[PDB]
């Protein structure tokens, strides 16, 4: 029992694991808990945010559990993590309606609804609830300052001005963690290269308030493409997995004029195709370029997938 | 937490627990593990054996776990449950050869190779080793005649003689119910009617052996026709579910020349349409008979299921 762990560094999906060993073990002796969140900076996803929405995919098809956390605490503060200018916070109407969006196309890519399947957290739940005196108190103690300001994330700001709000974010979503390492079972926190800073900051609040309950952290990578330009920019700005901002057939092309060189390993990162089916699409592309199949194919999959069996034709039908 | 005991018995698919309750209980607590089997009889599963499988994935969808047990030994000795006339031995050959039959179709109906999903057992693994002198001392000290000679399946037997070997079937399936409740935590056991006495002699072992450690059996009913005349039973014998034996185009067919009145019934039985989707395609057969749709969908689902996409195409582009 070691599988999954071997497709998902095949496919290259493991920027870096907290406790690499650790991590290999228990997913080779116990069914895992693993979740990932967002927040509600949009109302709508994009292709940045296909990547690790999917590896939760890998994860829960061999017997493990997914849980989806949309931001609807979080968001209201937003993520300085990358960002190199101060956030601007946002109307409760605007969050509280973007989560509407984002919500609709979890709801699409994950099967939410079983007795024993992946979950929908919102944190406005439980941060929703805890008090300015308290937070100090339960919190606050075992969250150092030097710590904080070691946050790779935290200097850009340091550097031209961090507000004090988002330099308490990283305390926003190690509770997070924690609820969910307490209340869900949750064991590992999956997110994007932009997250290493938060989910570490996780663990080491786990292990100060109760010696590290089993807690790890994963990161997929950032997906680059081969010439060195921007994954998901478009003029239109982003490729937006809401049909009515990009769509199946602005979708389609995006995926079929990919380029050959990113080509193959996309396939890896975003399609469920076997080691073998893509050994054979990497040929069709390395001696029959002609055809164009990997560029086709990955297409095809990626827009059955997002947007639909039946889109999927009326894009290719207007193709 | 207990959606799934709601569609199973929303959808009719419960003739009878051992224990409601109990069972009712961990199914709303913890990720149960049912397996079902099927002895080798054959090179090709039939449409009896669809409901009782599909059932396996009913669980799996939340959750749970299922585990798919290949006769490969106690096929040597064939299930006179149900039967009024003696079975006949058969050839090594045979039965190590029907199991690649089944084997090629359970594989395309379940998803076999994850490092925690189902599990293909051939009990000619734990059957293939226990000896003469053996079975009687471990097993067969509490496994009393009295109560073998109280198995409904049997008394058809004993009416017009039932060989030993018949007779000491049930005991071989009581080894593998026990083995596996033991081996891979199995708590459930889920088979047709045909398998009550089974089923059941398997948990009654269980607790002489050592106090049931927590095993109960369920049972999918009986998939009745509207006029009375046998499910599965074609001029060509039986309908299987292997395409060289019965064909995407004669399996389209059958499913939609059903008849309208067990026709929403049996959408619920073998479709993963939802109570709205199926709402709707009540209606449509209610008021617009003429567009044929329950019929219709039944067929292209079914189908596309057990035999593809594409056959689903080449097949009704030959209706
Ligand atoms: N603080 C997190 C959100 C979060 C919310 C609650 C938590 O308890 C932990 C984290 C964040 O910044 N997420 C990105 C987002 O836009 O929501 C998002 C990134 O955009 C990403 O590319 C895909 O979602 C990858 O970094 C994974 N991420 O969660
Ligand atoms: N003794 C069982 C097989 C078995 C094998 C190993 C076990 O440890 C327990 C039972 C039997 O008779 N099965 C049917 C078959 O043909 O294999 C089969 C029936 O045909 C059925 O209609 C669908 O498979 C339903 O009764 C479920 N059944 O298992």
């Known amino acids: 029992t070691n599988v999954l ?3 998902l560094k095949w496919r290259g999906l493991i920027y870096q694991q907290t406790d690499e060993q650790g991590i290999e073990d228990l997913l080779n002796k116990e069914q895992v808990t693993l979740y990932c969140g967002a927040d509600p900076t949009a109302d709508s996803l994009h292709i940045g945010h296909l990547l690790p929405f999917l590896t939760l995919r890998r994860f ?3 017997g493990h559990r997914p849980i989806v956390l949309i931001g609807g605490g979080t968001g209201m503060i937003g993520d300085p993590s990358g960002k190199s200018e101060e956030r ?12 509407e969006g984002i919500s609709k196309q979890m709801h699409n890519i994950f099967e939410f609804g079983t007795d024993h399947g992946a979950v929908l957290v919102n944190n406005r739940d439980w941060l929703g609830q805890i008090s300015l005196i308290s937070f100090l108190r339960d919190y606050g103690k075992h969250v ?7 946050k790779d994330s935290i200097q850009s700001r340091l550097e031209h001005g961090i507000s004090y709000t988002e330099f308490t974010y990283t305390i926003l979503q190690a509770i997070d963690f924690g609820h969910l390492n307490r209340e869900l079972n949750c064991k590992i926190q999956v997110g994007g290269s932009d997250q290493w800073g938060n989910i570490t900051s996780g663990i080491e609040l786990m292990r100060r308030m109760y010696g590290q309950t089993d807690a790890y952290g994963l990161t997929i990578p950032l997906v680059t493409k081969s010439d060195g330009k921007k994954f998901g920019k478009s003029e239109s700005g982003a490729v937006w997995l809401d049909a009515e901002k990009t769509s199946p057939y602005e979708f389609y092309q995006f995926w079929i004029n990919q380029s050959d060189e990113d080509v193959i390993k996309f396939l890896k990162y975003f399609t469920f195709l076997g080691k073998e089916e893509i050994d054979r699409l990497e040929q069709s592309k390395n001696e029959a370029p002609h055809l164009r199949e990997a560029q086709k194919t990955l297409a095809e999959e ?13 894009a290719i039908r207007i193709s």
Chains 1, 2 share one sequence.
Request: overall charge negative; proline content about 0%.
């Open 5 to 7: 762990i071997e497709d």
């Open 60 to 62: 829960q098809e061999h």
């Open 88 to 99: 601007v916070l946002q109307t409760e109407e605007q969050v509280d309606k973007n989560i």
């Open 144 to 150: 150092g300052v030097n710590y904080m300001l070691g």
């Open 302 to 314: 990626v827009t059955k997938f997002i947007h639909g069996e039946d889109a999927l034709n009326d």
